[PDB]
Write a protein that binds this ligand. Sequence first.
Ligand code: GSH
Ligand code: GSH
Ligand code: FES
Lengths: 111, 104, 12
Amino acid sequence: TAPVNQIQETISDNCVVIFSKTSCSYCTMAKKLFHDMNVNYKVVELDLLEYGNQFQDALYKMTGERTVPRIFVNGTFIGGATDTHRLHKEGKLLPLVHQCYLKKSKRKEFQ
Amino acid sequence: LATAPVNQIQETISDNCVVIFSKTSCSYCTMAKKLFHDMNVNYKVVELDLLEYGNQFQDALYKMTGERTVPRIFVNGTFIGGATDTHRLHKEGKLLPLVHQCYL
Amino acid sequence: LGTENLYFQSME
Ligand SMILES: N[C@@H](CCC(=O)N[C@@H](CS)C(=O)NCC(=O)O)C(=O)O
Ligand SMILES: N[C@@H](CCC(=O)N[C@@H](CS)C(=O)NCC(=O)O)C(=O)O
Ligand code: FES
């Protein structure tokens, strides 16, 4: 239950989350894509985590594949590297990010 | 690295026109294999993640090429690069003529 | 040729 809960919190606290491995060039390219679009993103490197296998299991259940990267925008699973690049090619990625940047509250102010 | 089997890499790359040192889990390697597949030329893969001595071949690749990454692609006994380099060669139409040199 | 496609079709 704990990995799923932590994954949910991360994707809620951050507009863009990339579940990644440091050794993977698909993941590097997904990072670069967001970087080039001037988007801040949260990276979780599954290979640097003690229980990274369990996070990959949790992500399989949530999204339908075990593979990295697993990319979330505004708490919604948008896809892996290829799906994310295609969304961008179609002009559909920036508007999702943008809507999220305009919604996400600064938690320190709402307490 | 002082004990890396470069001599073995050298045997493999002299005996086979196209050699792709690879891992099964890697999409860059998959894209590199698909390129040669689609060209309809013969190619050898070495799936380092499936081999007991995969780590030794990776030490040798690091020694020879200066990076411990996959894929590592050889054509006609010459290191041509990784996935990016191989696709750049192909974009410029320069990969197929290198493969052809094997058969001259 | 037959072996290549055998391999390839099983991977992809
Ligand atoms: N089409 C997927 C490919 C994903 C994929 O195959 N990822 C590989 C790494 S490139 C993977 O996760 N392999 C097994 C693993 O690392 O757990 C995408 O574009 O994200
Ligand atoms: N630019 C290189 C990238 C090679 C690369 O970083 N490969 C990754 C797999 S996609 C790797 O071998 N990683 C092992 C590590 O970084 O520890 C290419 O195009 O081949
Ligand atoms: S591990 Fe090579 S592209 Fe993902």
